Structures are given as structure tokens and as C-alpha cells.
Symmetry: C5
Subunit: 307 residues, 5 copies
Amino acid sequence: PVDVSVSIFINKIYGVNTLEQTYKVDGYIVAQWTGKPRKTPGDKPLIVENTQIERWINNGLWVPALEFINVVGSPDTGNKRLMLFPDGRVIYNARFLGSFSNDMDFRLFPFDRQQFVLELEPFSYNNQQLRFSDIQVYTENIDNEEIDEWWIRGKASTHISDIRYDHLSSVQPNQNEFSRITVRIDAVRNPSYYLWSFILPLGLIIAASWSVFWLESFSERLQTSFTLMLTVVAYAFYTSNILPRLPYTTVIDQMIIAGYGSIFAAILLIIFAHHRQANGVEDDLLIQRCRLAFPLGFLAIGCVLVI
Amino acid sequence: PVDVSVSIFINKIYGVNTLEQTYKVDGYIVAQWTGKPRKTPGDKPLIVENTQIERWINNGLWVPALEFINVVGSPDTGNKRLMLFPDGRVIYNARFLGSFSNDMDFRLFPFDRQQFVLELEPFSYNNQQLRFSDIQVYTENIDNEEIDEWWIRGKASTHISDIRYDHLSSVQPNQNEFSRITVRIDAVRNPSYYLWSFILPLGLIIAASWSVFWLESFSERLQTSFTLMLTVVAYAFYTSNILPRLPYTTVIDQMIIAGYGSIFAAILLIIFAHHRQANGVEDDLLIQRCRLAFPLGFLAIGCVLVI
Amino acid sequence: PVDVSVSIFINKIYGVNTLEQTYKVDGYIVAQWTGKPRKTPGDKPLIVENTQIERWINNGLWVPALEFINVVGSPDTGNKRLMLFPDGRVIYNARFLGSFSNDMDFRLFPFDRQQFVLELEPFSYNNQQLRFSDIQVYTENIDNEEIDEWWIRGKASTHISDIRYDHLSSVQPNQNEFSRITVRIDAVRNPSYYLWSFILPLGLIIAASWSVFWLESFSERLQTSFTLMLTVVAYAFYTSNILPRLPYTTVIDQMIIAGYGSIFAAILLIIFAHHRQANGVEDDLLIQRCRLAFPLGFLAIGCVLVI
Amino acid sequence: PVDVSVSIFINKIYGVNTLEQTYKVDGYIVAQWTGKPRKTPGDKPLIVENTQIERWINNGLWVPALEFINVVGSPDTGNKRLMLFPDGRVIYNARFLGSFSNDMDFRLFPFDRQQFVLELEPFSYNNQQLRFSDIQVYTENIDNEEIDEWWIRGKASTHISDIRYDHLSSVQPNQNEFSRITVRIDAVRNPSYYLWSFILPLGLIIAASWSVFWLESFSERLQTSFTLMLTVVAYAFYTSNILPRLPYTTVIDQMIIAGYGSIFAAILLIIFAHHRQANGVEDDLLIQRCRLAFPLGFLAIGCVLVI
Amino acid sequence: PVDVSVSIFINKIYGVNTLEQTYKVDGYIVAQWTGKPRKTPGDKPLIVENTQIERWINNGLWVPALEFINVVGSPDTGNKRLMLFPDGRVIYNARFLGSFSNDMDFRLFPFDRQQFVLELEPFSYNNQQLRFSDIQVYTENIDNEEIDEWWIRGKASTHISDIRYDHLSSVQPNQNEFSRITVRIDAVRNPSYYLWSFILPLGLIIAASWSVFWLESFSERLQTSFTLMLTVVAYAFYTSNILPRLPYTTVIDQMIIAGYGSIFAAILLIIFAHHRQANGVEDDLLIQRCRLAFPLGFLAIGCVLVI
């Protein structure tokens, strides 16, 4: 086997998206290995630019085709470069940019934790083993934590493993080990935007839904509650482009469900606190009579769902 | 004829879209056949990477152009390689990433069942017969049932058919039958999102629509209804984002059709219950007592009849 | 001149779009002409795949560059193939997938009827005359009854014509005849979706906007109307994404205009029936104080027009 | 220098975009110059198709690289063609499609008079002088008056000018003057769509804003106005996808501003006419009663503007 | 080392986007250096067009690969050119068009002062030192200030720095310093659109929220605020498409927060001014018969939000 020492320089992780759980990454790969010695012009290293590499691959040079595993589509490779040394070693350097994909857990949506993963791997050769993955992070999200949405903690985490591909039993089935380099960068979502756009107004609407008790005419109270129905409906589309069709409810979907349920219970407890009267007046039947401790007693039932 | 054994490795089926009934598929293809023997450098199998293949086809190598039938556009092939063995056989291996299209049936929308189909076929040859398909699928199945909207049941299903093409009747009669490989993957939609976003709130709005019958002031029994009209109009648009323009009503669209009438009929059961008399300028007295059966107790029949 | 016999196999006409009047088409072209005899390996028709064609064109083979006229952006050709026969004839076969553009007439929108047009033509040669077109259309959408939005009635109609190009008077003004193949496929829109989403709710709002006559409190008969003016405007956006910026009014636009007019006329008849200088009388038993004659008398104000 | 007479056949101008001031153009270019005589096969003109040009440029043929100045991105060139004559002249013909960009002025929006500009220019040579420009435009003009949004008036205007380029002052002083070919087509927007979608309903809301003065119950004359506030807010969004966020106000923006101001004044002249004292000991409650002169006196407050 | 003088001609900066902080730039690059003398045909500068460069690189010409650092993807290069002089120097000229990326600070959103940055840098050579960057910008500065959203004031400032790359210790660690050219252009947003679309109407809504105090029926003083809630929610989505998910609140976000808080405080003040009677039932006329003395304290705090 031949030894290949990779070096990944990350330039900027941008374009994050939660509807598809993707993120665009840009950077440089620098792979380096050792082959047979050679005679170069003069006695210096020989640099070979974008299209001059094909003429060297045609004549018999060995250059592996390193690919990214968790990529959507195919990366948009910029320039390329080879640097043939006279002592024997070779250094393939190339710029990459691609939309990678990972798995995200939005069970606690606004206060979220993810990790961006890059999985590099040879495409054709089973016996060429990556020795040591090094990563250099030059991203701007670490030191500008007030403009970005995703803070980046730590530095990185790199692991060199072996993958077993069983679909490659065409080749002798005992020769399908593929070395792989996984690189993880942990990120923390900055929740300070969803706190005054989906938690404060929805909380205010919820707390202002029990105040309809403080009225003299139920004929006005039903319309009062059906007015807040429209606001709670309005805050249901505003949260329809923030996160995907998830089967589990998040901190905001729970607030929307509670906003529906609180108003529905207001209706159901303002109807049955009147439709079993004994006199014939509007505000009676032990809930609408006093209106000094009951309009504040139903307030703590929602706090159970909050707590 | 020559015999070509195919093996398809599916990596991730993502980007499903019911608006156009498409889905993006990523994976690898490994076709393997047998030709004439040859002398290779040393005695090992000779591997030929991305752009070195085009120099072997020029010299006289036989490599078929396999295509996908049900693709939208043209797949974005990644790397590719040949593996020429000295005993004679050849192994063409190549990564693909396409945007395939199937037919979907949303007559029962949220509790849906589909199947993702892939169809390989030679483009130019009729006498080259694919022996057998072997799909190696490891897209997540049991842990995929909490994040992804679809669940992958079973393992797979592969068949090998013989299509007869009529537009190629210019050539000899027997020479217009191409073999084809079809691969089906059954999937079940996770309906747990449309149960607290389009059925729970609509189900409450439906039942909170005849509550206006439990009122006294006809001067407001129309405003309390025209507010729910606007609520149902609000939910009407929030559904046009999900589904295509289907001529048959789904399980959700019906809850919208029953959202106008159940409200609309309300007026038609209020108005005709308001002027049952020919004397008096004020409301109708004798009708305000039997409201429990005809005005409101009939939508209970509307709920137990169709459901 | 040389005689070319095109044959077009249509696979699926998808992605129709009325905002730009485009439609994507996928299929195969099979052109076939006769040249001079030649010696092929063995005595078989020699097949030439994707990239081997550009090498046969170098040595002096004649292959015309057929183009599509009414295409939006150059198409996305998939595989290509030549079939050089020993007796002399040549068969150029190639897959195409492109987004074509036709003209549409939405003067009667929901019950529409269009035709998809494909125009093929040589790009460089004036003296090479397409002889006989042949459409092979086993499309997946004529077997439709309630699946897709467009039914297909007949599936084929072809015509071979000539064209005079004036910008090509650089050559002698006689050498600018360009034979062209036109292929028309008549399609009929499935109106069963716009009947219970734009004709039913608007049709009910129209008749529910004149019901405000059955009231007595003019202090509230103007507010109960402005909650309906808020409904008709809600369907004015729901229509702005299913049609282009058309000068002529469709059926749905006519319905929305009639809704605006009906609500405005209701307001004006309410105001004039109360107090003004055009009548002078104060609160007669006009449209407000009557519940039988006039609230059913304005039913022919909208039912006078024919469409 | 060498004289190159360019002809331009305009096939269709579509995809106009008010939000970005772009428009896609599809057409042909036919440049033609004279060089040195040559011997061609036979005695006929020699036609050279798409990829055979790049081999004639290798041997020493002179073909200029004509670029488009005001293009967004790079155009999508379709087929190409050369026609080498034996007498010496050469005719380079090529199909083009590109998203061009001009400057537009929406100070009077619906009745626009924008114009479409195409700017062709050599990229490398200053001494090659475009000598004569013909445009051959047969895009739909007088039948375009009912389906397309823009009418074409006159269809053609061309001019050949010279740009002095300062960034090329590294070369000799006289050798940075590049000729051009400018092509201007006169378009006129068809305003018949914005007259019954943004002017009729907005005007009806304007006229229905003072109608609240025909009331007595001040306790509801604020709700009857806060409903029209919501109506004007609804129409405020329906305009935000037509105009490119212009600093100057168009007609519709002026109408929205008037819709805010009219209702705000209606509020401010209701509140200060409610507690307006008669003499200082009893509130004047007779200004609101007179509903003949006062409600009409507000109609001319908006009709003072002459736009 | 090789001394390379760079000139950059900027043609138009369009497509600015603040939701992701990009901007598309189009222009020309002219790099010029000195090599070894040579004999050219005749005695003139030899011009080499797009596809003829890749041949001169084959024979041994030295052309550097200059990349852009802060680009999203890879620029869409148009034409290229080489101008080989006989005295020795070479002039590589090429058109570029790419979507760049800078950092923007919306802490004071409408009155923005963002700036546009371009960064050239060699990709492969460290001993290839750019001498002196000149920039030629004719992006309009005085006449454009009424049509486009971003004024461009002053000249563009250019700086040649040296970056040290740590990930390039593969090559001898004392030769990893690459020169870089940075070009900054000063932009200033034209805040004449957000003044009559997000500050004027929001200001009128905020100033019309305290006006509910001048009312008599508290049974209706609670519905007015719940109607204003809907308008304040309507002005909350209209802002969610002009800004990114920013943690710091802008001016418009502060206005939305103040609009929520003003109506919430109005509710909490009016409900307590009602509860002052030691109940919430039996509305009395004491608050209106003293509306000129007592409730002025409820508005006196409402004008503290301003100062």
C-alpha cells in the first residue's frame, strides 16, 4: 500500500439550511504521498497547473481520485495543482466547494446543537491508506459571534476509519476495505432571534387569551375569542418556513398547539359556565359571577404545560 | 449476445417532492461482463480512472452506455473507473446522482404509500442481455422513522424485462427489443405532522362553527360566522403549498369543503329560522327553544354520516 | 439534396407551466439518410457511441446539426449514437430533453385547451430536405382520467414546411429555404380542481354578501360587510400565482371583480336607503326594513350577464 | 483594419423581469468579412459545423471573439457555423441566447415605456471595424397586443459607436478604441392588468373610507375604520412583488400612502370632532348628526391632487 | 520572483443580496508581466484567443492561475486573451463575472454603510509578487442615486498584502506566504423605501393604539386592541423577507417589539383601570364623565416611549 497524508483547510462554512439539513463548505485539500524518484527541470520542484495534469496522467503518473461521501451532487472544484519533487514525493493540492449533508435533531429547536461532517475517501483504490488527517480552521464564525446564526465551538475532530463495501464482491470479496477520513465541527445555534419573534408574541397572545373573562356580555366574549383565533392562525404560517415537516413537536409548535388549546378550552369553559344557569342572567354559574379570582385561576393551567 | 451482471448500491434517497412527484437518488453502479483475454502490466488487474477511459474506448474497447429511463434531465455522474482483468472480464464502476420521477396516488394523502423506481437500460444494443440485478440498499430503515418523512419498508424488488420499441422499426424486425432492469423500493409516509397542523386545528374550527347557534343576538350571529369564514379561508391557502393540483379531493381538502358548507349552511339554518313568522319586527321566539336538534344537532348527523 | 427521414419518440411531457407558457419534453430523435457505401468490420452495422462520433466527424463523415426552434435555452442532450451500415445509409439516434415554449390563450381559463408544439429544423444546410416525419407517442398521460392536469386527445399531428430567412441574404437570395418539421399534440386541461377551490368558495361568498339585507341595525350593517370585503381580497392573492399578468379577464378574475362590485353596491344601496340628497325620504321600508322582497330582488343583478 | 458587417436576427424576447430589470433574448448572429482566397474541395462554399471550427482555428484561421457587453453571466451559445468561400470572404453564423440587462424608469409605473438594448463588441481587436449593422426582427408586434405584457413599437434602431477604454492604457495610446453595435427596441407595457387589480379595488376602498362618517354610534366607528386599516395592509403586500424597491413612489405606492393617510385623517377628525365643545359647558353633538354636507365635504380632500 | 502588475476594470455591481450578504460583480482583469524575448510572426504583438491559450501552455509558456478568495462557487469566466510581445512582456486579459461575499453589519439597518470587497491571489506560486494594483471603476455615482438602492461614493481603495498559510507546511515551511490584492468599494444604502413602507404605517399604527382610551364601552374596548394585534402581526411577516436571522434588533424590529409592547401595556392598563371598581362587571360611566381629568395618566405614560 501507499501512504497519503491529507490536510484540509476550511475557508468558510456558509449557506446552512435546515429544511434539507445541508450546508455549503469551501476550502482546500492537500494530499501528499511518496512515489519513485524522477528528474525534473533544473533541480527545483515542478508545479503543474489545472489542465497540465491530464498530460501527466496520460504518461503514467499515479494520482488518486479522492471523493467526498456525504455530498449533494458533485463539488465545484476550482483550480488544481501538482508539485512533483525530485526526491520522489508528490503533493496534489486542489480547491473544493460543495453542499454537504448531515443529520439534524430538532427535538429542542431554538437551543440547538449540530455538527458539520466532511467524509473524504478514495474512490477506486482499497490499498492506499490515508495516514494522518490534519485540519486547519480559518473560519470567521468563531470570532464574530454576534452577526452569525451558528457559533462554532472547539476546533475540530478527525478520525481515520475503514469502511466495508459488500456491493464490491465482484472484485475478490476479501479486498474491499476503504479507508475514510471523517471530520466533525460542532456548532451551536444562536437562539436570540426566535426569542423576540416566536416566543414573546405567542406568549403574549396566550396570556391575553384568558383575559376575555373580564367582560359583561358573552355575545361580545365569543367574538373576542374568535378574534384571537385569527392571531393564533396567523402565527402558524410564520413558522412554516423555519424547520422541516418534523413528526416530533418542537418548542414553537408546542406553543402553537397550546395557543389553539387554550382558546378552545376558553370556549368550552365559557359555554358550560353559562349553559347550566339558574337565573337567566349573562354572568352567573360560579365562574362568571365573581370575576375576581376565577379569571386568574385558569391562568395557572397553561403554566403546567409551560412547566 | 454478451452477459452483463449489474449491482446497484443506493446511498441516500433524499429530496422527495410531491409537487412534481420526483425524488433524488445517489449511489453506485457496478456492471461486469466478460470479453477477450489480454496482457496487463505485471499480472494485477489494471484500474483506469475518470479521463483515462476515453483513451481505451478510442483503441477499441467495448463499454456500453447504460442509461436511466425515468430520469428528469440527465444524471450528474461523479467519478468512474474500469477494472480490466487479465483473464478477460471487465468491471465498469461509476457513481450516479439523478433526479428520478415516478407516479404517485394521493387519493388518501397523509397515510400515503409510494414506491421509488429506478430503471436501467442499454442505450444502443439489443443483443446485450443483463443477467441479474443485485441491489445493495443500506439507506436507514428503523432509525429513519423519527426524522425522515418517509419510511423504507422491506428490502427491495428487482425485475428484468424486455421492452419492445416501435420507433426503431427502421432496423430489422427482431432487433428492436432492449432488456431493462427495474428496481422498486416501497415507502410509507409518516403522517404524524399533518395530524396537529391540518386536522387538529381544522377539526376544532369545524366543531366551533355551530356554537353560534348557542347565542341570543342575531345582530352578531352573522359576524361570529363571518369570522370563522375568514379562518377557514386562512387555512385554505396553507394547504395549497403541500399538494399538487389534483382533481380528486384528499383527506385534508375535504375538511376544507366541509368548512364552508358547515359554516354556510349555518346562515341558511339561521336566516330561515329567524323569519319563520309573519308578524313582529324583533327575532323569532318559538325557535329559540328547539335549537338543540334542528340547527346544531344536525351537524352531529353530518359527522356520524360521512365518517 | 439529401433525404432525411426523422422519427421522434415522445417519452413524457411534464413540467408544464402557464406563468411562462413552457413545457418540458423528453424523447428520442432518429434521423436516417443515405450516403456512399463503405467497408465496415465484418459485415455488420457499425455502432458508434457518445464520444466516438466527434472522431468520425473529423475524418470527413457528414452529420447534420438538427436544432429545435421553439426551445428556451439549448436542450440537454443525453446519449448519442451513429449506426453506419455497409450498404451506405446512416442512422443518427440521440436522446433529447428540453423546455419548449408555445403560445397559450386563457380567455376561458379553467376549461382550457392548448397544443404542445415541437419544431425541428436543420441549422446549417438549406439543401437537405426532411422527407417524412413520424411521431411515436406512447405517452403516460393519455391513459390519464384524474391523475395529471392535462389530458391528451389524439397525441400526434405532423407537418413538413419550408421557411424563408431574410437575415441569410448574405448568400444568394435563392439559397435560404430551410425545411422544417412541426409536431402538434393537443391537450385539454382538467378543470376539476378549480371548481372546489375558486368557483365554490367565491360562489358562496357572492351569495353570502347580499344576505346582510336581513338586518335592522344599520349601526352594524356596515361592519358586517367590511368583514366580507376582507374575504374577497383574500382570494385575490390566491389567484395571482395560477395565471400570468393577462390583460383580458379570466373567469376567476371576473368572479373577483363581481365580488368587489357586489359588496360595493351593497354598501351604496344600504347608504342610499338610509339618508342622502338623491332620495330625501328618511328610513322608508326599502331594502333594509323588508325581509322578503328586496333581499331576494337583487338576485338578478348578478344573474343578468352571460358567460 | 478589416471590415465586419454584422447581421442580427431576433427570434424572441421573453422572460422580462421588472424586479431585476432583465430580459432574455434568443436570436442569431451573422458576421461576415473578407480575407485571403483559398482552394476549397470542389468549387462550392465549405461549411464547418460546431466542433470542426476549433480545428480550423488551430491551423491559422482568423475568427474574432464577438462578445455582448450588457449581459448577465455568459450567454448560452447553441450551434455554430462557418462558411468559407473560395473567393475569400468568410461568414461566421451562430445562435445566441442571453439574459440582457438595461436600465428602467418606473416613475410612472403601469404606463411604462422601457426599451431593450443589445450591445455587441469585439473582445480582443481594436482595429477590426464593424462597418454595417442590419437587424432582422420578426417578433410578434400587432398580435402581441392581447397576450403578452409588452408591445413592440418600431422594432429596430441601430448605431455604431466607439468606446475609449482606459483600463487598457498599458498598450500604445491609439490602440484602445473599440467599435460597437448597439440595438434598441422600443417596448410599451400593457397596463390593462393593473387597472382592475390595484386601482379599482384600492380606489373603492379609498371611497369607502369616509363612509364611516354616515354613522352615529362612535363606539363602533373606530372598528369600522380599523377593518379598513387591515384591508389597506392586505393590499400593501400584494404590491411588494411587482416593483424593485424603488426610492421614488409610483402610482400604486401613492395610492397605498393615500389609503393610510385618508383613514388616519378619518380617525383624527373623528376624535377631535367627538369631544369638540359647543361653548365650554356641553359637548357639541350636532356636527356628526348633519350627514348631508359633512360626509361629502371630505370627498374633495383627496381630489385636490393632480398627478 | 516574477513581478505582475494587475489592472481591474469594474463594469457593474448588481444582484446585491442582504439575506445572505452577496453581490455579483462583472468586469475585466489585465495582468501583465515580463518574461523572455521571442520571435513573433511579423514584428507585431501576437494575440491569442480563448481556446488557443491551452496550446501555448502545452509548449512551455508560463501563465499563472489567479483566483478570487471571497467568491461563492467559481466565477463564470467569459473570454480570455494573451498578447505576447516580442520584447518579452506578456499581457493576460480576461473577463470575469462572479458572486462574491462580504460581511455586513445591520445594527442600523436602513442607514447602512456596507462595502464591497474583491480579493485576487495566486493559487500556486509564492514567489510571484504582484507589484501595483490599479482599478478602473465607472459604476455610476451621481446619476444612479435615484434608481438603484446602493449609492457608490468615492474611489476604490486597493492594498497589496501578504498572507501566511499554515496548512502549507508540506512544502518547506518557510515558503508559504502568498501575496494578495484587496479592493474595497464604499457603498451606502438609499433608505427612501423603508420610510414610507415600514416606519410611516407602523408609526401610525403605534400612535393609533393609545386612542382606544377615548371610548365609553369597555365591552368593546377589548376588541379594538385585538384588531390592532392583527395589523401588527401583518407587519411582522412583511419584514421577515428583507433581513436575515439577526440576533441584534434593527430599527424595524424594534418598532415591531414596541408595537407589541404598546398594545400589551394598553391592555394591562385598561384592565386594571376597570378592576379599580373592585370588580370586572357592571361597567359604569365614571371614567367617561371625567375623561378630561383622570385618564390623562394613561396617555401620559404612552408618550414616554417617544422620550
